[model samples]
Target: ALSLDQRIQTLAYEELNKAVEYHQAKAGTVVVLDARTGEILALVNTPGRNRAVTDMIEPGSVMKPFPIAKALDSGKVDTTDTFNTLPYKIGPATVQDTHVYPTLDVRGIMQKSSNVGTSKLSAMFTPKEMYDFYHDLGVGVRMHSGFPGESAGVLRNWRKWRPIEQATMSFGYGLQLSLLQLARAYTVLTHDGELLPVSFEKQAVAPKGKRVIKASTAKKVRELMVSVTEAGGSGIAGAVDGFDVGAKTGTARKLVNGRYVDYKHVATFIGFAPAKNPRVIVAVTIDEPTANGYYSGVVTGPVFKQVMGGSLNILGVSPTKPLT
Candidate 1:
């Protein structure tokens, strides 16, 4: 009847409202999408601004998979390719993981959010290749919504990217995107490497999408992300019972006065449920969550699990994973 499913919309709105208010965060948004059709089923903005569509922030580890997926597509990297995950030198700065990992394969790179591993794999990419991959995934473009507040997030030219920029960008720094844009980017995983166009109005027919990566490569990446919710992955909190969840947690340090301040951060969780046959995609982003730890897994991951599971249930999408 409407562009949004009323029941799902109500659930998303209320859940986002409470989470943001409870954390006393500056702003938050929850967006629910029909994974197959790219139709926006529910979207919530806690305050006046549609921050999900308008406000851009440096996505942390959430952006990790794209470059990896792209490398897979180009036959430049394999899931089995191993890298030493100890402190890796780029220039004056070093890429390090939260804990020292002696070695990780490409798949383990994503599972552990290994900055050093990502930096190593992404080195195979020329800046041009890197830029093309993200741009194809909808990083720097505004979708059809054209909401007055929409943002075409910053994507600098390959020519402008430096050596350090290339490394950090692989692990999700040096680039910016609104939460909605990141959600759209994830459509590549949900739809066989195609970036689906956004639709707020209910569509009687499904629309076409831009194919960015090969189908096999997309499937490979999707399976790799599924491990992120399993044991030892940072996003374990995002899993819902009886659903195979795929997600990533990004804790982006807030940029202020032309530099990043470590203390302030935006926590982001982006995931889709019933991974192999995803029906719903959800994103939760909260800025400056001060009441508790600002880790996205601790904060937004549970929120994603709640709204995604509820939306799946409300839409009559049966659980794909076996409970027994």
Candidate 2:
């Protein structure tokens, strides 16, 4: 007979311990949660606090969708709304996409992870308004989960941001937030306009809600999320074997000495499965993945497939049915 602890240790922990040891020198960690219930499946980090739900990093391009959702909720844009993504200067820092683009719709911009378009969209709102939205979404606030060294992240005083900082922060460059915070923030988009508090204890017991967006607006965004995993979207790499997955990819240049450093990158993929029914949401982050291209599609997307594939099966989520 196998003890449940022994079973987990044999099935999951041993391999994970080695992986953690291998990556510890590089300051990497992997955190897995039960997306359906927020139950922590695994928390693997070396010599660092569990940062996935705690320490905040610049969410980079991954943060774009929230602000976009906020804009849509505010009636500033819709799925069909379009913006240009060209070599341009926001204020002091020149905004450029790693990939070439001319103009894109809100849906296209999000699917393509367009920093330029996101910056422009974020510029439409004042810093305070943006800050308020972030607060509403639970970005720069600490969760009482009691993870050691968990940071709420830093949002500069809205009165103090330079125009470039404001614009770039809106799209996730200059700002910082923990992966968990960002993951939790999307619950607004997830639950039809409410940001549910993340529960580390007993599953939040019918969590209270705050109406942040209209249900119709959330439904539209959820529709657009599907296109990310469809053909011609950046998140095609994140598609699993049979599930209807909706996802977004993000990649950002690592800054050094207050400037964008070449080659050093952070890649992230955030999405949910069974798009029609909305069962589980998974977010994967790979900081500075080597031996491959550094884009989110190249780095985090496949990992997402591996992780989400296992997750869906564990939860009994079925694949999308074939068209007759």
Candidate 3:
């Protein structure tokens, strides 16, 4: 029989290998990082695309969270603040939702992934204000890693964004960004208000931290992220056994023949562990997962759990609560 440590290591290897197999089968990419040290633990991409760390995509609603963090950091909003998110037409573009919005707090808006709520909040800032915040948060910029085909993404010159575009972009659709860029942008909320530049190298040089928010603001976002793992959160797929986890899911359609196609969905889950002090930020995307229940909560969550569980165990970090 194997000793406890040996058995644990064996199990960890097995789980890690399982993730590898899943990545190979799906032709997807997975990036895992040590949130504390900004170290790259794994960088796996399939179907031959340096796309994950470099290629830019619409990012859908996944980009919504950053502005929220930026807003709170700037003392513009609080977690308990509310917004009216009724499903109304924003200048001929009909916003769709199964829910009604009367009044919603910051936490409520995020829990439902409410575009209207975010749009309203974002409207508080002018396009220039929003663009400045985006730049400060490190969005629409390359990591300067010298990777080929890397894009700084499109933030549209501040002078050109129409109100409609600004509204939509505020809630994540009018602009474009790379997955790694999105992940790096989120580093502020996860890493105690510091936006650490991303690195593809296994061990990164010391991070030059940029303070974007107060520690308190980051903590507030962390709590709201935890709610998603609970009953009313956006991603029901992110709960883990040994640590407090917080995550957000995103789904968007692919553009076909100059128009957006509804069926093909790009799903992603972004979050970190040990809510009080996040140590890792994992972002997983499943491109157009087959018709059999493709919601991010259903598909990406389990993958998050599998990888997160194995990851925490291997790193010798146990859960805060007792698990049955």
Candidate 4:
């Protein structure tokens, strides 16, 4: 009666457990979706908790693409246009990239996951405009999947955001969303601008998708995301052999007792395979990973590659690129 592929589900569950245990993490969640049909192929939460549907956390750099896509669609930004990615200060808060970039373009911003670059890009838009765009993309909104305890994550009123708050929100802070909602948002890229409705029940006919951006804009975003997994990109660990992959990595510090903890982090990777024509989307989140590493590319990207590779293979999705 379930829409999930049994083989893919089992493989994903096994891999999720292995990744969480191997990393010595507290817990993890994995969600795999059928890109074309909007059906969940696999959903796993370690320790029997449905973190995929219930737990909301700041999405970190994973939220970067939405604003970039908006800028592209509005024709206010060009992929070739350059920005100085030095440490940017808005009031007392400064956004800094892990590695400094003297200059970078829109594509470079994504490839490097540059918080400074993204913050600069976001400043170009009015806060209300950005909020509206994100709302249309389904952030801070219930997915209406009928899942209990689903959170409409904390997207604050744009009017209430201070200059510093706006800058932080640009690179994914000051807001939160469940892993399921996060994955659901990425479907816009795979469907070429349409945000499809998510469902637990299988569908005979694919549900119509609401357009969120121009097809060209979505294609550009997808291309930028693909670069994130290429050599020299931030999400290189998410790369899969024999297929093109588009992915984003996120590492967000956990807010504890009114302050952000430095060592506690939630690492996540969200990606779709055969990037040219994606058939599936896989999202992985590792909570409070204390061993090995805490960066999303280091902690969760490999999990994404493994689960996505197995799902594609089991679904008979042919590789679009030559095997490496």
Candidate 5:
């Protein structure tokens, strides 16, 4: 008696829910978008918060690529250009990385998720320019899906930003965005410079999108992002066999009473698979994970790999990488 074909894979949905429950997380959200069509194939929010569209949180290192992309598009930096990865100070705040590199190229900055390097690159733009770039990427904006209580997040005016605010925002702290907003913004690199409109309803034709960056620039960024899933990269667990995955991991401290809590954290991973020619974009977030680990790679990467691999198989996408 069923006539409609659902885009969501039931098995993947169950597995995603189980993954969150197994981790004993406070909450979680997962979205799988058809990269070519802008169709939401699967959107799951555990504990049923609809957190994918309603819950906003600091995206941590996952937000690093956008500013770097902006800098590249404006010819402010090159992929090969190098910067010192030492602890960078801006006013009272000090930006440091988990691992120190004497020097890192722009690509290395992204691969390592270096806060200091990203902060330095962010200084290339005025606050207004930086805010505008984030706005263009759909921060502080709704996806317009008519979902009740969907949040626009909170992106404050750049005019109010101090030096520390700017530096923190560069690595994703000064503002907030829903998991859906974060996932949708990444379509720029997926589609090569275009930011496509998201559609909850499936459509036969792909919707036209606005070009936000140069195609070549987007291409280069995509190439650089692929390094994040390789060996020695932060998102190695996100890598699926026989598929090239480009990903970013985020581990943000939760703020309470105007202070960041060390024990509470938000972990996230956002990326597209078959990196050479991405067909699906997946974003996963786990809130206040208490069991296993708190790092994004530890908390979210495996979920992404499992869901992404299942979705790819369900959609019958051919492998882009050779089977090992």
Candidate 6:
């Protein structure tokens, strides 16, 4: 008897497992969280390693929205602010996007998954502020889930951060987070800015939450996340028909033995459906996808659709599109 909804857990496992198999991935995991109360509806993983708790992963683009949201909440940046999103060479570290963009707003930055735009946003915040923003969202915490050998998720001290380190952290490079932490961090989007403590047991009543950001900021950021699955967005592959889902994609190369590998990658897609007021949060991840495609959109997107779509159907939620 797992601490999960039985039907959703079974569906979630099959959906994620099949994706990993189809993609020829080394491993995979799926975490379904009831974002409103931080309950683990389902947590399933394939063999080789748990990865959920053991591997500290450097999440790529999915981390972009958090800093941007925090900047908006702190009044350091506004929604109207735009950045020159072209490539940059800062102290031997290159920040570039797949396609060159001359300019982009906050939403455009996330929609395009622009590292340059996010790094520019990083320049606006002090290191301390940025660290606390991430820490509050359940990063860098030991014993986060009480899983044996749970990774603390590396976040170095502010004093140790160089300019390049801060910039890279903006787009999820310098620090690492376990699969579980990444999913828990995203609960803010559905929880109205309150960071409810993650739970595995079925709760009779929802536990109280800690306010991390303003409700207005949470709503605004959630809306902005919508653009990532809209037209011309990087995460379009993860779109679910008849339902509006807001999500982020991450495709980070695995850093093996302090060296970034050429062919290895960690692909991830985390999203919430019924975007107006989200009920479920599904996070899918695949490791070292060697066949077909490895990008988060292409690799984990379909898995998100099947798992999220199936989970929603089981919950009897109405669709947003094709209304009767």
lDDT of each: 0.85, 0.69, 0.72, 0.88, 0.85, 0.86
Better of 4 and 6 by TM-score: 4
Best by lDDT: 4
Q: Give the winner by TM-score.
A: 4
Candidate 5 residue-wise lDDT, 63-164, digit = tens: 998988998999978999999889867766788888888889988898889998898889989999999989888889777955788889989999889889
Off by over 4 Å in 1: 322-324
**Clash pairs, model 4 backbone:** none
Of candidates 6 and 2, the better by lDDT: 6
Q: Give the TM-score of candidate 6.
A: 0.95
Model 4 C-alpha RMSD to native: 1.1
lDDT of 2 by residue, 175-279 (tens): 788877776766666676776666545553566667777878777777778788888888898888777776788887787888888768777788877766566
Candidate 3 lDDT, tens digit per residue, 1-56?
Answer: 21123333344344434543553334455556667655555555654767676667
* Per-residue error (Å), model 5, residue 123: 0.5
Residue-level lDDT of model 6, residues 103-154, one tens digit each, is 9999899888998999998888899988888888877876456567778898
Kindly list the per-residue Cα lDDT of model 1 for residues 1-324, writing each as its tens digit.
556898988998888878887787888898888888888888888868788888888887999988888888989788888888889676687788888989999878888898888888888888998888878887788886746779989888889988999888888888888888888888899898899988787788778989899989988888899989999788998888888888888888877898879899889999887888788889999888988678988889888988988988998878776765
In order of appearance, the predictions have TM-scores of: 0.96, 0.87, 0.88, 0.97, 0.95, 0.95
- By summed lDDT, which 10 consecutive residues of candidate 2 come out lowest? 1-10
Error of 3 at 13 (Å): 12
The 10-residue segment of model 1 with minimum total lDDT is 315-324
Question: What is the C-alpha local distance difference test score of candidate 3?
Answer: 0.72
Residue 77 displacement in candidate 4 (angstroms): 0.9
At residue 91, give the lDDT of candidate 1.
69
